[PDB]
């Protein structure tokens, strides 16, 4: 069926909004898919028109071949514009538009159009009537029935066609004879119609009006009844709705559910969409389940929830209400599905899998709010426990699958991310993803090994770096300094606190109307990038700060304070114990906040595609010189540095030009200052521990001013830089904290310590014991400098340890942490069940324990390799990918070449309704579909087969020339190895990513993915046939999305309130979790084949079950637009994975504390620690820090809105659930 022009038709339909099927079938009839068609009349083209249409309205502004030749993209786009104009001009009647297009208009057209208008199909010409008839299916018209009155239909009963046509007078014959299959369902035309207030991106004046006059901007998103005519009415309606809902909450659903969600048997499925409800007046005190009830808390700890961010107990309440609604509804869903299945097989008990956790969650929350007697706690008598994952004992319950019970009787269900049994088993059976990590050694073990004895030097370095917890030496005056370990722990703690501060500030910033209310301007990660970039630019140029909204102002203040503190610690690393510690900071006397200079790999790649190497270097140098000549402060500091460097009283401009060129060479001809996470991933040799990249990227110029390149287009060094403080601030912190620790503990730099340790190794090369000690010391240096790599799994194990500690001491925080973790587990397990039911490939092959086919294994190898290659070659900056996707549209190109007014990309961008409406699900599906396309293209190229995307039209959809595609083929052949089995490997990894053709490969895959897989509004089985394992998975996910949008609840909800934002949130959460689970399943099947034959069945059964797939989903969900990473908010210290005299010593020591943190009450919303606060901070993380980190980290997994929980629940209900089996 496809004929190489499908992407062109799809884009020409999204732009100039018109039916894709209409344009495609017009191509069918007119030309039967040939670009130049020989016609006796004379018209020659894809759409077969010379006539006057051609010049017409289309050109005469550009050099046009026209009547002779037409560019196929231009021809299709112009014809699509004409058809859209006709369709609109004829109201929505596509058949009259098709008649006008085929028969023309005026000379013979208008009489036939009028004849159409009065019924009168007899007056319409025979050819036009046949043309309309062959367009009947794809075209929608009020006149379709009248034309029908003026066959490959699936048989209702009996034999096909004749049996039901010539006969079957009985009803079924009538139903068949009146059928008329449509084949014309458009999800955004029929199901989700873009309203006026969706898709409408605010102007600055509208944005300011909304910011000033709208109390809660989320009420802008709902459009109940008729659409308000003007923004003032929308604002009025939003405010009235907000006041009404705030008033209603006092007796609303929160208050009604505050007593007995599941003790009362509340069924959330029979519920109105509960839009206004934000969990608020929701304190679940179930009367009964409150046996004992002290009004006074036992300690000053406990009392309330110990979170330290403002708005706590309220976002927690929203998460709790959403989780209770979801869990009760999922229990109801499971019971109903069990009843439906018992109809078929009465002798099958099935398992609820939700009502146990939900009952215990109600009991815990009830006791938490009532302060006493958790009734969910089990009777621990006759329990031997035994079995410790991280020193936490547990008993497996035979009654509940997985679901261990803790020391106090607290029972953690399976799929609870923190329970020790699931964590342990996930560690034992984890698909390829298990790595070296930090399992080598920890600070406590290295202290015992190296502070132990045998050398004066080894012990000297150990005393400087590592601290002994308990030692036989017990040095009375071992060191009056911090030591590198303590500095590292202190810096980790302060960084974590400021990360939670930044997370809260960024959430508030990116909830503002610019990104949340109107039509979706940008993806979530792109809003995050824009806000971080605004903060960074305002930091560098303070005049931009008046342009920040108060929330972005808070964000910028947090980031500025963090970077100022880091600079202060590098400049004065003697602020710790060591007095001979001096200024690890690269270039002092440059007095200003240093936001790290890190340059995008792909920005440099683009600036090398033109102006290859010397061009980009000259551009960087010349922009720096623009800064130098423009601003006298830059000139002053650069002149001072050059005078000091060359020892000359005067500086000639040749000197500063040479300096700028030498510094720009480091960016242009080296990848040291780029993202380059992969080279840091390598650990051997201690080569990269020297030469911190963040500090060497420092220069005295300003990257702000732009220089025009030889083609006249403007480039500034800021265009290269990577903002977003999501990969940038954490990595900068890792490196600089390592450097600060090394200098504050040892007077020496990282380089000097590296050389001295290598000298010790070379000296004691003979002794095995000494060699092991030196290797432990090297491991300490790797941990300090951040080489390490803790992995994702430290999050849940750290949470388990901290929650155990809370259970010992802070009861209310303990129970709240259990509640939030249980809610996360139920969310993810419900997702696993529903999507295992719904998506076909998942249940049929990947969620099943049975091993897959050999061809299926090859497809899985291709898919996982495609994901890996995407990770290597994907542009990290969200701006780069958004502009790359938008710019390739015809509108931007035509405006850039012909237009006299500048316009802007993202203003002329066509944009799929999938992006405008339902943006988050769209981004997840683009990412996964592009990875699938990469895998398919690579596998086909290495195999030698020709992809469907090698064809000219889909290449024209991207900017892929004939030549570029051949270059892509050569690149894949050059850097990729075809394994003996389906296994795929890369050669040199780094060199492959450095190839310029890698960007062409990525662009090809991404644009093909968009055009073919995600852009169309229709999903079909034939569509799923073409793609590979990942492609089929994500097409079935897109089909699942469309099914959900057509579900009764979701359809009714959109009719009542519109509010595509809520549906987008729900479907994006579902898609994230499901793709995580699917990737886990594919990697598990691959690892199973990695095992020998007898072990494959046991391993697949053990590693492919709802608990482990659910734990993978929580661990590896993407969370694309998340401010900071979930590891950063809660992450253990790298080195720190794990009688009364020392007690009394610690007591008498802390008896004296008089730092301002102890004296003063903590700030509400922003610590804003300076160097004094960092130095005076404890190394151990306080329970407030852990608890706020847990709440922030689960804010991504566990949504705060009860409405999105209800929407996810109803999507699952319409989908169905597996229900386990037997026990």
């Amino acid at each position: 069926v496809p004929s190489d022009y499908d992407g062109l038709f799809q884009k020409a339909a999204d732009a100039n909004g018109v039916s894709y099927d209409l344009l495609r079938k017009v191509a069918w009839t007119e030309s039967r898919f040939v670009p130049t068609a020989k016609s006796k009349t004379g018209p020659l083209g894809m759409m077969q028109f010379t006539k006057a249409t051609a010049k017409a309205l289309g050109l005469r502004v550009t050099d046009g071949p026209d009547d002779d030749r037409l560019n196929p993209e231009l021809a299709i786009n112009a014809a699509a514009k004409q058809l859209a104009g006709l369709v609109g001009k004829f109201d929505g009647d596509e058949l009259k538009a098709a008649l006008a297009y085929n028969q023309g208009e005026g000379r013979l057209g208008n009489p036939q159009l009028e004849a159409y208008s009065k019924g009168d199909f007899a007056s319409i010409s025979e050819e036009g009537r046949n043309y309309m008839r062959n367009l009947l299916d794809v075209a929608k018209s009020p006149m379709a029935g009248q034309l029908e009155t003026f066959n490959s239909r699936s048989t209702f009963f009996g034999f096909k066609n004749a049996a039901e046509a010539e006969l079957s007078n009985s009803v079924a014959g009538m139903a068949f004879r009146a059928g008329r299959l449509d084949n014309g369902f458009d999800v955004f035309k029929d199901t989700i119609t873009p309203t006026r207030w969706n898709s409408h991106i605010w102007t600055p004046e509208e944005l300011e009006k909304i910011r000033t006059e709208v109390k809660n901007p989320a009420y802008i998103n709902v459009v109940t009844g008729g659409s308000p005519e003007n923004l003032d009415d929308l604002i009025k309606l939003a405010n009235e709705n907000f006041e009404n809902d705030s008033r209603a909450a006092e007796a609303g659903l929160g208050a009604k559910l505050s007593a007995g969600i599941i003790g009362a048997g509340v069924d959330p499925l029979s519920y109105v969409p509960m839009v206004g409800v934000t969990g608020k007046g929701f304190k679940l005190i179930n009367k009964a389940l409150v046996v004992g009830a002290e009004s006074a808390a036992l300690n000053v700890a406990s009392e309330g929830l110990r979170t330290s961010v403002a708005g706590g107990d309220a976002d927690y309440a929203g998460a709790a209400l959403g989780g209770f609604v979801f869990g009760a509804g999922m229990s109801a869903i499971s019971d109903a599905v069990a009843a439906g299945l018992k109809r078929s097989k009465p002798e099958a008990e099935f398992d609820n899998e939700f009502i146990g956790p939900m009952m215990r969650l109600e009991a815990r929350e009830t006791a938490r709010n009532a302060n006493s007697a958790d009734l969910s706690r089990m009777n621990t008598e006759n329990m031997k426990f035994e079995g410790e994952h991280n020193g936490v004992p547990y008993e497996d319950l035979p009654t509940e699958r997985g679901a261990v019970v803790l020391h106090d009787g607290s029972v953690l269900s399976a799929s609870n991310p923190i329970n020790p049994k699931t964590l342990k088993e996930f560690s034992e059976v984890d698909p390829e993803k298990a790595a070296r990590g930090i399992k080598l050694a920890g600070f406590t073990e290295i202290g015992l090994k190296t502070l132990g004895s045998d050398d004066a030097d080894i012990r000297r370095v150990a005393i400087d770096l590592v601290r002994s917890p308990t030692g036989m030496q017990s040095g009375a005056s071992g060191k009056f300094g911090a030591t590198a370990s303590d500095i590292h722990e202190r810096l980790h703690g302060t960084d974590q606190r400021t990360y939670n501060d930044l997370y809260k500030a960024m959430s508030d910033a990116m909830k503002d109307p610019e990104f949340s209310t109107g039509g979706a301007k940008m993806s979530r990660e792109e809003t995050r990038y824009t806000i971080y970039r605004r903060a960074a630019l305002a930091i560098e140029r303070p005049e931009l700060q008046k342009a920040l909204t108060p929330s972005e102002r808070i964000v910028m203040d947090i980031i500025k304070r963090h970077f100022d503190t880091k600079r202060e610690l590098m400049e004065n690393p003697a602020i710790f114990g060591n007095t001979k510690a001096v200024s690890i900071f690269p270039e002092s006397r440059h007095k200003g906040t240093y936001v790290p200079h890190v340059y995008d790999r792909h920005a440099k790649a683009l600036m090398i595609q033109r102006y290859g190497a010397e061009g980009l270097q000259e551009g960087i140098a010349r922009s720096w010189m623009n800064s130098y000549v423009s601003r006298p402060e830059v000139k002053a500091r650069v002149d001072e540095m050059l005078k000091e460097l060359h020892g000359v009283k005067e500086v000639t401009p040749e000197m500063v030009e040479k300096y700028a060129m030498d510094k720009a060479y480091g960016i242009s001809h080296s990848d040291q200052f780029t993202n380059s996470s992969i080279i840091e991933e390598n650990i051997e040799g201690l080569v990269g521990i020297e030469n911190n990249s963040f500090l060497e990227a420092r220069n005295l110029f300003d990257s702000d001013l732009s220089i025009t390149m030889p083609d006249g287009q403007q480039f500034s060094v800021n265009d290269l830089r990577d903002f977003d403080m999501f990969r940038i601030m954490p990595a900068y912190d890792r490196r600089v904290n390592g450097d600060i620790a090394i200098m504050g503990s040892t007077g020496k730099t990282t380089k000097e310590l590296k050389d001295e340790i290598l000298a010790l190794k070379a000296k004691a090369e003979g002794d095995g014991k000494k060699t092991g000690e030196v290797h432990a010391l090297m491991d300490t240096v790797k941990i300090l400098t951040g080489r390490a790599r803790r992995n994702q799994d430290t999050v849940w194990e750290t949470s388990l340890r901290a929650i155990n500690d809370l259970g010992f001491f802070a009861k209310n925080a303990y129970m709240g942490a259990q509640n939030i973790t249980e809610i996360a587990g139920m969310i993810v397990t419900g997702n696993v069940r529903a999507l295992g039911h719904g998506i076909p490939i998942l249940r049929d092959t990947l969620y099943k324990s049975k091993p897959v086919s050999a061809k299926e294994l090859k497809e899985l190898h291709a898919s996982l390799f495609g994901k890996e290659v995407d990770q290597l070659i994907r542009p990290k900056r969200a701006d780069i990918v958004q502009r790359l996707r938008e710019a390739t549209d015809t509108g931007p190109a035509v405006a850039n070449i012909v237009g006299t007014l500048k316009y802007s990309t993202q203003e002329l961008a066509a944009r799929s309704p999938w992006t405008k409406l339902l943006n988050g699900t769209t981004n997840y599906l683009l990412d996964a579909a592009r990875q699938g396309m990469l895998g398919d293209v690579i596998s086909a190229t290495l195999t030698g087969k020709t992809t469907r995307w090698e064809k000219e039209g889909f290449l024209r959809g991207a900017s892929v020339t004939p030549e570029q595609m051949a270059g892509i083929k050569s690149l894949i052949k050059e850097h990729m190895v075809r394994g003996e089995d389906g296994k795929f490997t890369v050669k040199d990894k780094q060199a492959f990513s450095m190839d310029p053709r890698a960007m062409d490969l990525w662009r090809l895959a991404d644009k093909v993915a968009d055009e073919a897989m995600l852009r169309p509004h229709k999903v079909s089985l034939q569509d799923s046939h073409a793609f590979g394992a990942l492609g089929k998975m994500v097409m079935q996910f897109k089909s699942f999305t469309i099914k959900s949008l057509n579900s009764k609840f979701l359809r009714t909800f959109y009719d009542g309130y519109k509010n595509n934002r809520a549906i987008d949130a729900a479907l994006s959460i579902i898609t994230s979790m499901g793709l995580a689970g699917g990737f886990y399943a594919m990697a598990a099947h691959v690892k199973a084949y990695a095992l020998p034959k007898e072990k494959r069945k046991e391993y697949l059964e053990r590693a492919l079950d709802p608990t482990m797939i659910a734990h993978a989903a929580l661990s590896r969900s993407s969370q694309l637009g998340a401010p900071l990473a979930m590891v950063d908010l809660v992450g253990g210290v790298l080195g720190f994975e794990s009688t009364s005299r020392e007690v009394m010593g610690a007591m008498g020591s802390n008896l004296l504390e008089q730092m301002p943190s102890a004296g003063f009450v903590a700030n509400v919303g922003a610590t804003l620690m300076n160097a004094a606060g960092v130095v005076n901070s404890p190394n151990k993380a306080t329970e407030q820090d852990f608890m706020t980190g847990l709440m922030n980290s689960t804010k991504e997994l566990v949504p705060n809105d009860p409405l999105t929980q209800q929407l996810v629940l109803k999507i699952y209900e319409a989908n169905g659930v597996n229900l386990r089996e037997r026990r």
Partner: peptide
């Protein structure tokens, strides 16, 4: 329109057949 025409034609055929049956029984 299509439903009306289909049901009308079907009803004509059914009434024809029923009339034949009734006249046969008489």
């Amino acid at each position: 329109e299509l439903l009306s025409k289909v049901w009308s034609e079907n009803q004509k055929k059914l009434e024809e057949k029923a009339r034949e049956k009734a006249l046969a029984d008489v």
